Enzyme design. Structure first.
Site, PDB file in Angstrom:
ATOM      1  N   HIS B  41      11.649  22.033  17.709  1.00 48.08           N
ATOM      2  CA  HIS B  41      11.704  20.763  17.195  1.00 48.08           C
ATOM      3  C   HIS B  41      10.325  20.349  16.632  1.00 48.08           C
ATOM      4  CE1 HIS B  41      12.358  17.865  20.614  1.00 48.08           C
ATOM      5  NE2 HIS B  41      11.271  17.445  19.980  1.00 48.08           N
ATOM      6  N   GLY B 143       7.327  11.780  22.670  1.00 46.17           N
ATOM      7  CA  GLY B 143       6.008  12.822  23.021  1.00 46.17           C
ATOM      8  C   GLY B 143       6.200  13.568  24.359  1.00 46.17           C
ATOM      9  N   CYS B 145       8.464  15.661  25.164  1.00 43.93           N
ATOM     10  CA  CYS B 145       9.209  16.841  24.818  1.00 43.93           C
ATOM     11  C   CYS B 145       8.210  17.895  25.144  1.00 43.93           C
ATOM     12  CB  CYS B 145       9.725  17.052  23.360  1.00 43.93           C
ATOM     13  SG  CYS B 145      10.801  15.505  22.942  1.00 43.93           S
TER      14      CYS B 145
HETATM   15  N1  LIG Z   1      12.614   8.725  24.581  1.00 35.82           N
HETATM   16  C1  LIG Z   1      12.545  10.187  24.279  1.00 35.82           C
HETATM   17  C2  LIG Z   1      12.782  10.863  25.231  1.00 35.82           C
HETATM   18  N2  LIG Z   1      13.040  12.128  25.285  1.00 35.82           N
HETATM   19  C3  LIG Z   1      12.938  12.648  24.000  1.00 35.82           C
HETATM   20  C4  LIG Z   1      12.677  11.941  23.089  1.00 35.82           C
HETATM   21  N3  LIG Z   1      12.827  12.659  21.562  1.00 35.82           N
HETATM   22  C5  LIG Z   1      13.940  13.021  21.243  1.00 35.82           C
HETATM   23  O1  LIG Z   1      15.033  12.888  21.482  1.00 35.82           O
HETATM   24  N4  LIG Z   1      13.755  13.862  19.913  1.00 35.82           N
HETATM   25  C6  LIG Z   1      14.766  14.483  19.369  1.00 35.82           C
HETATM   26  C7  LIG Z   1      15.746  13.801  18.642  1.00 35.82           C
HETATM   27  C8  LIG Z   1      17.094  14.377  18.295  1.00 35.82           C
HETATM   28  C9  LIG Z   1      17.427  15.628  18.690  1.00 35.82           C
HETATM   29  C10 LIG Z   1      16.250  16.573  19.377  1.00 35.82           C
HETATM   30 CL1  LIG Z   1      16.303  18.039  19.642  1.00 35.82          CL
HETATM   31  C11 LIG Z   1      14.973  15.656  19.499  1.00 35.82           C
HETATM   32  C12 LIG Z   1      12.470  10.576  22.765  1.00 35.82           C
END
Ligand SMILES: Nc1cncc(NC(=O)Nc2cccc(Cl)c2)c1
Ligand SMILES: Nc1cncc(NC(=O)Nc2cccc(Cl)c2)c1
EC number: 3.4.19.12
Lengths: 304, 304
Positions: B41, B143, B145
């Site tokens: 992603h 950030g 990820c």
């Molecule tokens: N606060 C936070 C913690 N952990 C990750 C994120 N980012 C996040 O979830 N990004 C995202 C959104 C939808 C699907 C996919 Cl695959 C990725 C944000």
């Protein structure tokens, strides 16, 4: 989102751990520049520990009696001295992995990371707080002495603790990196009981703020209180008194959430008086006090 | 003595973290040998996330569109490919700090350490468990990820998780290092609700054993139970069923403490039925389930 008991990344400190042996006693040492710091009780037999005269026991030790090993390579000891309850072993090689560092003496309520080591090898890392009775509730076995506590400010490691002993109650006592014990403890196998382990109020409030930031809002009430009124309840529940300095330190968290510090105090007062009623805050059933306001800001903002 | 939520020392993994940028998206990558692994992603705009066709979005990307930076030095990308939900970026330089490593896919109930990173820089380390609903309860911000979960067997780092997303409930989902998500989750900004977050029974029992080893014995009772009887109560309390495999895995802890596994089950049954009554076990007011039997043995024996 999510809020975890998080330790600093330990790599910088792993690069400093060595094994120190003196006679039959093996423990950990911290190698910074050309000096290896370790608990002075490395010179004791478990027999000496009952009533050690460290100056006297040290007279029978020479540089070649302190065996320092970094990885699988022996370091050459060219000097040794005692500073308070730590030994400083001058080695002939500066640690190539020495990070930028400071020696700090923390206050009760301050948190830090501990890298538990055995035989100069790191086994795990966890987050602690210096308790108001100057003990820490660690996880240390025989051989863990010389393991250190620290904080990291970007690339500067501030060493604040060195492990020396476990009290008969299973709580832990140690020194700063100048060898001065936190609290009234002494490096002697004698009866030393800890004082009241009160709750670090400013830390609980910081953690309540972290709970609100992370969506756990159930405990928020419609009340407010004053410092004097709150402190009457805090005293009753063995909580540390809250000062205007603590309120000031919580200002950023109050601003980010829109919850005045005294309103969060009133929420805490009701949690103390009513209990959790089987509910949890940030997956905990008790009020957590081992996150400082700085820790909450750091974790909720992503400081590296 | 003492029992702490302990993470593995993170140095070996800190040496693998890089920053990966694709367009306006910056996240973390894991650099092992001459490959940098990161969530696919990274190629998405927050707009693409609603319904991304990754194969199609990838056609518009070239090696020079993936900016990989280790410390403050840029790595040269000479190849890229998608494996499931991860991108593998072939770089021209093998990571000099690559530890001995394995890619493992863990089971629910397994614990691991997470090194939370931002912009390729580590900010903290904490201990997790893969929940029975295949989520993890982490602490991750935008950030984070590409931050990874791992276990260490002396000098071999087994990577088991890579962070990809936060569910609308604030729980986290990710993949193994082959890019396969744990559970039914997909890398798309869509409604995905997690299943029941049941308690990892074998882990709670391991933690009760750790409590007995560390002197917290109040909860020990005069009863025993059977697997069938215990499991009737476990089902009612949203606890995972206990199998003979779990009993076998607890054998070492049972031997060290002299408490038969089924007797510890009966103690747990009463804790479920009666609650803690305001008491704590290992400083916790709830039954902890994020320590495996191996973790308890490791912490109580001092494995480095
Ligand atoms: N606060 C936070 C913690 N952990 C990750 C994120 N980012 C996040 O979830 N990004 C995202 C959104 C939808 C699907 C996919 Cl695959 C990725 C944000
Ligand atoms: N289990 C354990 C945890 N942490 C430390 C130890 N060792 C330990 O207390 N040694 C010792 C005994 C009396 C006084 C002094 Cl200064 C040191 C043992």
């Amino acid at each position: 989102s999510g809020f975890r008991k998080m330790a600093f990344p330990s790599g910088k400190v792993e690069g400093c751990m060595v094994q120190v042996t003196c006679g039959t006693t093996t423990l950990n040492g911290l190698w910074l520049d050309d000096v290896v710091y370790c608990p002075r009780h490395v010179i004791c037999t478990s027999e000496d520990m009952l009533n050690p005269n460290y100056e006297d026991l040290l007279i029978r030790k020479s540089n070649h009696n302190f065996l320092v090993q970094a990885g699988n390579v022996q370091l050459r000891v060219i000097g040794h001295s005692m500073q308070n309850c730590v030994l400083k072993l001058k080695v002939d090689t500066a640690n190539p992995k020495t990070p930028k560092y400071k020696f700090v003496r923390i206050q009760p309520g301050q948190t830090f990371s501990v890298l538990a080591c055995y035989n100069g090898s790191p086994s795990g890392v966890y987050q602690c707080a210096m308790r108001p009775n100057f003990t820490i509730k660690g996880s240390f076995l025989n051989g863990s002495c010389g393991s250190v506590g620290f904080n990291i400010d970007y690339d500067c490691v501030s060493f604040c603790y060195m492990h020396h002993m476990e009290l008969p109650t299973g709580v832990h006592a140690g020194t700063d990196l100048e060898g001065n014990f936190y609290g009234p403890f002494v490096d002697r196998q004698t009866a030393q009981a800890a004082g009241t382990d009160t709750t670090i109020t400013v830390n609980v409030l910081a953690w309540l703020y972290a709970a609100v930031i992370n969506g756990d809002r159930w405990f928020l009430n419609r009340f407010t209180t004053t410092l004097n009124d709150f402190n009457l309840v805090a005293m009753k529940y063995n909580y540390e008194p809250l000062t205007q300095d603590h309120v000031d330190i919580l200002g950023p968290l109050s601003a980010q959430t829109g919850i005045a510090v005294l309103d969060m105090c009133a929420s805490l007062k009701e949690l103390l008086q009513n209990g959790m009623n089987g509910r949890t805050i940030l997956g905990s059933a008790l009020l957590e006090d081992e996150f400082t306001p700085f820790d909450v800001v750091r974790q909720c903002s992503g400081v590296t």
